[PDB]
RNA sequence: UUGCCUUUUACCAGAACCAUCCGGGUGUUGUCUCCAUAGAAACAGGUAAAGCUGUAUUUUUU
């Protein structure tokens, strides 16, 4: 239980950090604000995944 | 924060703080260079020259 719980919490944290980041990236893309091609691709992928979820 | 852009340096152009630099005086010393060398004169007043003032009949002194 405890170890598992801790792991869960950290993955939640990661998600929070990740999802927010993705959102930010998307916003940037929408604007037209020096997005990296690779970064944009990642955002597209990540965002797609999020949508699916 | 923008822009070219999509990787970065190297860049666009604005902002705010900051620094660096190329320079600048001023003052005081110290030096370097070039020219130079006197340790005592005013008072009594003259001689000469420079600074300023002047040109008795009701309110100044006739």
* CA A14 to C1' B53, whole Å: 106
Residue A41 three-state SS: helix
The span from the CA of A43 to the CA of A33, in Å, is: 14
The span from the CA of A22 to the CA of A1, in Å, is: 31
C-alpha gyration radius of chain A:
14
Q: Which of A's residues 28-47 have CB atoms within 7 A of nucleic strand B?
A: 31-38
The span from the CA of A24 to the CA of A17, in Å, is: 11
Question: Which DSSP state fits A17?
Answer: H
Q: Which nucleotide is nearest to A36 (CA to C1')?
A: B6
Locus of tokens 């950290």 = A10
- Contact between residue A43 and residue A29 where contact means Cβ atoms under 8 Å apart: yes
Structure solved via: cryo-EM
Q: Which nucleotide is nearest to A34 (CA to C1')?
A: B6
- Contact between residue A22 and residue A47 where contact means Cβ atoms under 8 Å apart: yes
Resolution value in angstroms: 3.8
- Single out the residue of A12, A14, A38 nearest to residue A25, CA to CA: A38
The span from the CA of A30 to the CA of A40, in Å, is: 11
Distances (CA, A) of A31 to A34, A38, A50: 9, 17, 21
């Amino acid at each position: 239980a405890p170890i598992k719980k801790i792991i869960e919490r950290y993955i939640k944290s990661k998600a929070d950090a990740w999802v927010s980041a993705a959102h930010y990236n998307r916003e940037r893309i929408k604007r037209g604000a020096h997005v990296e091609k690779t970064m944009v691709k990642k955002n597209l992928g990540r965002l797609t995944r999020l949508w699916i979820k």
